[PDB]
Design a protein around this ligand. Structure first.
Ligand SMILES: Cc1cc2nc3c(=O)[nH]c(=O)nc-3n(C[C@H](O)[C@H](O)[C@H](O)COP(=O)(O)O)c2cc1C
Ligand code: SF4
Ligand code: FES
Ligand SMILES: [K+]
Lengths: 513, 151
């Protein structure tokens, strides 16, 4: 009795593009032909211009079809879909698609391969090997191994993760916390989303290893309200892991204890900021805390707290499973390891490209993204999210590396890359940066709370062509005001999209070339 | 809103650390909004002031204090969807609906909301309705998805 395994992604981006209808159509079609299939709802390979990307297990490996719509499915069967027959939508052996093959998926190794919620799938691809090794190590040794890897904070401030863990380990306290920052607030980012939706056991393992390293028994995943799929997948994964003894009071019979729960955010971008996040968890308004206490020492409820981004925590298992030196050899300078870069915006082939630091923007734009979606020339690329600077073409050859970007005023951030073609109006981008700040300001700082709105209104005067030379000066003083009087990068980095647009594209503001 | 179930939602959560937002989520998820009458119940079970509790509700854009329409359509307005046309889609959505952002249709079927990134940045312009996602949304597809809502 012949049963063909078929993969249809359940990643929310695949879902947005019809994946469920395709899966039901594949099921209906199989039944109408009296053929037996097993439809696996995998993660997304992260090649979104091919989603929904249907894969078929054949003797040659998994082969792919994409993008598949519900209407295409009877024709897919007719062309021999169940045996990998060729079709207008054929893409071949999935792992051979260069966009995928030419990556260094250390963190994203399973994403798109596995059923996200199958412990069997997870453990058949190194899942929980990192934990098994960490369980046989001293807490300080786990900290040292994360230190030696060169891992840095993938939320974008890139603080050295191991030194942060060492602080929490050394603090003296009966209660300690692992806090996973899943606020992923930046436009152009979806790596955290994909981890939580497509490989949540990896996040769980990473936080459990963090718990072992510092002496925490309770963890929280604060996940933005804009990510309902991540939240439901994570709660299901936590239940499955607890029931199989990967969580709870006797993890794999080791006597180690770790409990995990998801908390839903509520639409405030500034709750991505680590202390505003802690305020939110505690049931308060998300106002940034002052720092006479560093959160690693007095964080959640005043306890020593590890606060890390999804990708930072998601990279701990491979670091434990394969070793610090394996991880550290990737990258360049002090940017060790890899980053899941996210190609977004006006991009022909957008999605997830995990590569060692040192890849240049241009390589990513042309060799992976394929240029713009419109087909027009790229004019500006914002890297690192809404607080990142726009890069012009002349910056596309700087290596993506925390230090080389910071030197010229670029922001690697989380690795999101948002492409704008030549139609972009950079004065309006500047307006939006000010507008976005007025919307999200926690309210503690005057240039952030109200200076932003005044920036909107001076920008309006520029957009309608009123007194451009005068009002641009006003925007620059306002930006200098924000750089000098903001308690966090929301206010302090709003000038970065504004000043780069101003300096690189003055003509959009009515100024001479 | 069901006030008796609001008090049960609250009482089940009253010993959770940082209970306020989970309580607010469960009330909104089951009732549609957080009624004013709920605030003294939340305040008293949490040993918080009514003012404190109101301050948290108003701070967080996710939370609404009056019922929305039958469907909340969220149109992403952030930079990735801007780059593939979120602004034109935003203006078409207002005309096709007859209402601005944070507002509800005259027939009560749709409340129009902005959202700042759905994590669909490679497949924009993105739209979310309830928890149903839509990518590559232009004017025609927007009209179509709104068409599907009413019927
Ligand atoms: C406005 C603002 C928003 C932020 N949003 C996020 C976010 O969405 N996800 C994240 O991981 N870090 C975010 N951060 C950074 C966190 O404050 C902190 O640097 C990070 O979570 C630390 O984890 P890491 O060391 O692993 O990067 C934000 C900071 C600011 C000032
Ligand atoms: S800069 Fe803005 S977000 Fe940051 S603390 Fe000040 S007011 Fe709040
Ligand atoms: S910017 Fe619209 S989905 Fe991310
Ligand atoms: K609103």
């Amino acid at each position: 009795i012949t049963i063909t395994t078929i993969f249809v992604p359940r990643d929310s981006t695949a879902l947005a593009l019809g994946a469920d209808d395709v899966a039901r159509a594949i099921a209906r079609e199989a039944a109408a032909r009296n053929e037996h299939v097993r439809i696996v709802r995998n993660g997304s390979r992260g090649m979104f211009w091919l989603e929904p990307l249907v894969e078929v297990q054949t003797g040659a490996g998994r082969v792919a079809y994409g993008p598949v719509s519900a209407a295409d499915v009877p024709g897919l069967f007719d062309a021999g879909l169940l045996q990998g027959g060729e079709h207008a939508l054929s893409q071949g052996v999935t792992e051979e698609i260069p966009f995928l093959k030419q990556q260094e998926r250390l963190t994203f190794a399973r994403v798109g391969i596995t059923d996200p919620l199958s412990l069997d799938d997870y453990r058949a691809h190194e899942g929980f090997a990192g934990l098994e090794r960490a369980l046989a190590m001293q807490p300080a040794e786990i900290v040292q191994e994360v230190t030696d890897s060169g891992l840095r904070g993938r939320g974008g401030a890139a603080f050295p993760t191991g030194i942060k863990w060492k602080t929490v380990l050394g603090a003296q306290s009966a209660v300690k916390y692992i806090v996973c920052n899943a606020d992923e607030g930046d436009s152009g980012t979806f790596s955290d989303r994909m981890v939580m939706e497509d490989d949540p056991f990896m996040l769980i393992e990473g936080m459990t290893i963090a718990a072992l390293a510092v002496g925490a028994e309770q963890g929280y995943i604060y996940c933005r309200s804009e990510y309902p799929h991540a939240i439901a997948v994570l709660e299901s994964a936590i239940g499955i892991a607890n029931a199989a003894g990967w969580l709870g009071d006797d993890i794999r019979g080791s006597g180690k204890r770790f409990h995990l729960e998801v908390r839903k955010g509520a639409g405030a971008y500034v709750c991505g900021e680590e202390t505003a996040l802690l305020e939110s968890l505690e049931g308060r308004r998300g106002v940034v805390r002052a720092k006479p206490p560093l959160p690693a020492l007095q964080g959640l409820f005043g306890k020593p707290t590890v606060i890390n981004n999804v990708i930072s925590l998601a990279t701990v298992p491979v670091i434990l499973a394969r070793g610090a030196q394996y991880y550290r050899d990737y990258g360049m300078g002090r940017s060790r390891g890899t980053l899941p870069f996210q190609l977004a915006g006006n991009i022909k082939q957008g999605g997830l490209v995990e590569k060692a630091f040192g890849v240049t923007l241009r390589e990513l734009l042309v060799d992976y993204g394929g240029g713009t979606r419109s087909g027009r020339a790229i004019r500006a690329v914002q890297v690192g999210g809404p607080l990142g600077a726009y890069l012009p073409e002349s910056r596309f050859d700087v290596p993506l590396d925390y230090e080389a970007y910071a030197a010229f005023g670029g922001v690697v951030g989380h690795g999101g890359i948002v492409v704008f073609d030549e139609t972009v109006d950079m004065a309006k981008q500047a307006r939006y940066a000010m507008e976005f700040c007025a919307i999200e300001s926690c309210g503690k700082c005057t240039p952030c709370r109200i200076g932003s709105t005044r920036g909107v209104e001076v920008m309006d005067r520029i957009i309608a062509g009123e007194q451009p030379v005068k009002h641009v000066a006003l925007v620059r003083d306002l930006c200098d005001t924000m750089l000098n009087g903001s308690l966090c990068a929301m206010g302090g980095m709003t000038p970065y999209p504004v000043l780069s647009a101003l300096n690189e594209f003055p003509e959009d503001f009515g100024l001479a070339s | 809103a069901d006030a008796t179930r609001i008090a049960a939602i609250v009482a089940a959560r009253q010993d959770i650390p940082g209970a306020l937002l989970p309580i607010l989520h469960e009330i909104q998820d089951t009732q549609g909004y957080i009624p004013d009458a709920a605030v003294p119940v939340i305040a008293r079970a949490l040993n918080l002031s009514r003012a404190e509790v109101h301050g948290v509700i108003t701070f967080y854009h996710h939370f609404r204090q009056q019922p929305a329409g039958r469907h909340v359509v969220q149109v992403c307005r952030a930079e990735a969807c801007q780059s593939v046309g979120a602004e034109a889609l935003a203006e078409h959505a207002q005309r096709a609906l007859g209402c601005g952002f944070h507002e509800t249709t005259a027939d009560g079927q749709v409340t129009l909301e902005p959202v700042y990134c759905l994590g669909q940045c490679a497949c924009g312009p993105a739209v979310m309705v309830g928890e149903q996602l839509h990518g590559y949304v232009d004017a025609r597809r927007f009209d179509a998805l709104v068409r599907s809502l009413r019927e």
